[PDB]
Write an enzyme that holds these catalytic residues in place. Structure first.
Site, PDB file in Angstrom:
ATOM      1  N   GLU A  35       0.842  -1.347  -0.301  1.00  0.00           N
ATOM      2  CA  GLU A  35      -0.316  -0.179  -0.172  1.00  0.00           C
ATOM      3  C   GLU A  35       1.160   1.354  -0.268  1.00  0.00           C
ATOM      4  O   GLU A  35       0.547   2.599   0.948  1.00  0.00           O
ATOM      5  CB  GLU A  35      -1.157  -0.268   0.925  1.00  0.00           C
ATOM      6  CG  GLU A  35      -1.828  -1.203   1.662  1.00  0.00           C
ATOM      7  CD  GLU A  35      -2.685  -1.600   2.544  1.00  0.00           C
ATOM      8  OE1 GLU A  35      -2.835  -0.085   2.416  1.00  0.00           O
ATOM      9  OE2 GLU A  35      -3.834  -2.361   2.605  1.00  0.00           O
ATOM     10  N   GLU A  45      -4.094  -8.782  -0.614  1.00  0.00           N
ATOM     11  CA  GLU A  45      -5.040  -8.425   0.935  1.00  0.00           C
ATOM     12  C   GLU A  45      -6.859  -7.894   0.752  1.00  0.00           C
ATOM     13  O   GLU A  45      -6.665  -6.775   0.265  1.00  0.00           O
ATOM     14  CB  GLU A  45      -3.966  -7.222   1.890  1.00  0.00           C
ATOM     15  CG  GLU A  45      -4.064  -7.570   3.133  1.00  0.00           C
ATOM     16  CD  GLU A  45      -3.622  -6.433   3.893  1.00  0.00           C
ATOM     17  OE1 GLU A  45      -2.117  -5.813   3.385  1.00  0.00           O
ATOM     18  OE2 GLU A  45      -4.136  -5.636   4.083  1.00  0.00           O
TER      19      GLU A  45
END
Length: 386
Positions: A141, A230
């Protein structure tokens, strides 16, 4: 309306399904045996621990040993293993001012080379210890980084062109928190970066169904894979069981993704306790993982045959697999038709409010057809010999 499963029309290849051992310390054999053996999870995601600091340069890898142990348990069960960093070692970071916030952290530009060596050292530690890492990720991220290391799309591009080619493993990137295409577009549009990318990873936090499709990746997808790396869901309430069932379906059907990997394992928003209790959400993922083995392919199947009914289908190893989700509050009968092949019969496994991948009704297949009851708010996997 009937579902037509066309066994002769193949879609993306299935890499697998799994979860993450990140921040789980050393997971027990019990939990790994339940998830990787019983539920057949085929992929494990490690977090690369930056708490090692600079000690990786002198070859003291002890702080990487917990994830090595996790990797070995997954591998012994036939899973592949990949790793994502949240931060590099502290000595490679610097602060920068991100729209008036001086606390933001990024990888120093003069550290990109060292960072690739760091990533290579993780790969080699795993290799020397008997685990051949499937892939390694540049950053987790990079686009929601307030609590970790930020990379702009351009920064990620620079590393992917100039650095990532020196990595001794498959390279995964960008792992945008929402699959934001601005994070991956520069990689796909650059011939060198694209060459240096093996797996396009993405996360699902806030991604709408239409945004699961990625035309540019599809046009650029030769030799590449696309994984959702994820996601978690809060709890085992029926709404989240259905939310999770449906999203995996959408990742397969709309997303054409090769893999769907859950977030961390022994946590309340995870799949298990550390003492070996297994949550309903683990079985939702197992409806996929157990029966659709690495190397299977998705095949064409009528995707939404009825209101609140979602269906996908897969083949491989002389087996056919149909996953049918009913998000409705009433049981509904669904007819399925095989074309370009058939099955002698099928067995079923169901997850719903009272059941965890429970054995279902054995059903005869006649003239390429069988009908099944899909319970209210349930996911069912049917498996048969092709």
């Amino acid at each position: 309306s009937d579902v037509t499963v066309n066994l002769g029309s193949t879609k993306q290849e299935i890499r697998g399904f799994g979860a993450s051992s990140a921040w789980c310390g050393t997971i027990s054999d019990y939990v790994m045996n339940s998830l990787y053996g019983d539920l057949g999870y085929s992929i494990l995601r490690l977090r690369i621990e930056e708490g090692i600091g600079d000690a990786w340069k002198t070859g003291n890898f002890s702080k990487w040993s917990p994830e090595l142990a996790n990797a070995k348990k997954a591998s012994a069960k036939g899973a592949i293993v990949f790793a994502s960093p949240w931060n590099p070692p502290a000595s490679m970071q610097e602060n920068f001012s991100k729209s008036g916030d001086s606390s933001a952290q990024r990888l120093r530009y003069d550290k990109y080379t060292e960072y690739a060596q760091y990533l290579n050292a993780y790969v080699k530690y795993m290799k020397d210890n008997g685990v051949d890492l499937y892939a390694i990720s540049v950053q987790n991220e990079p686009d929601y980084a307030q609590d970790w290391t930020w990379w702009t799309p351009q920064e990620m591009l620079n590393f992917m062109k100039n650095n990532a080619g020196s990595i001794n493993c498959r390279v995964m990137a960008p792992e945008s928190f929402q699959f934001l295409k601005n994070m991956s577009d520069p990689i796909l549009n650059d011939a060198t970066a694209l060459d240096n990318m093996d797996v396009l990873g993405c996360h699902f936090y806030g991604t709408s169904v239409n945004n699961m499709a990625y035309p540019l990746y599809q046009q650029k997808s030769a030799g590449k894979e696309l994984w959702m790396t994820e996601k978690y869901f809060d709890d085992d309430t029926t709404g989240n069981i259905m939310n999770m069932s449906k999203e995996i379906h959408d990742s397969m059907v709309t997303g054409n993704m090769n893999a769907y990997i859950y977030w961390w394992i022994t946590w309340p928003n995870g799949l298990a306790t550390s003492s070996g209790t297994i949550y309903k959400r683990a079985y939702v993922l197992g409806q996929f993982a157990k029966f659709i083995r690495p190397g299977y392919k998705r095949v064409d199947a009528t995707a939404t045959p009825n209101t609140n009914v979602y269906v996908s289908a897969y083949t491989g190893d002389n087996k056919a697999v149909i996953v049918a989700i009913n998000t409705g509050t009433a049981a509904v009968s669904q007819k399925f038709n095989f074309q370009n092949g058939s099955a002698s019969s099928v067995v079923s496994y169901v997850t719903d409010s009272s059941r965890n991948m429970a054995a279902g009704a054995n059903i005869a297949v006649t003239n390429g057809s069988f009908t099944a009851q899909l319970p209210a708010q349930s996911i069912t996997t049917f498996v048969g010999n092709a």
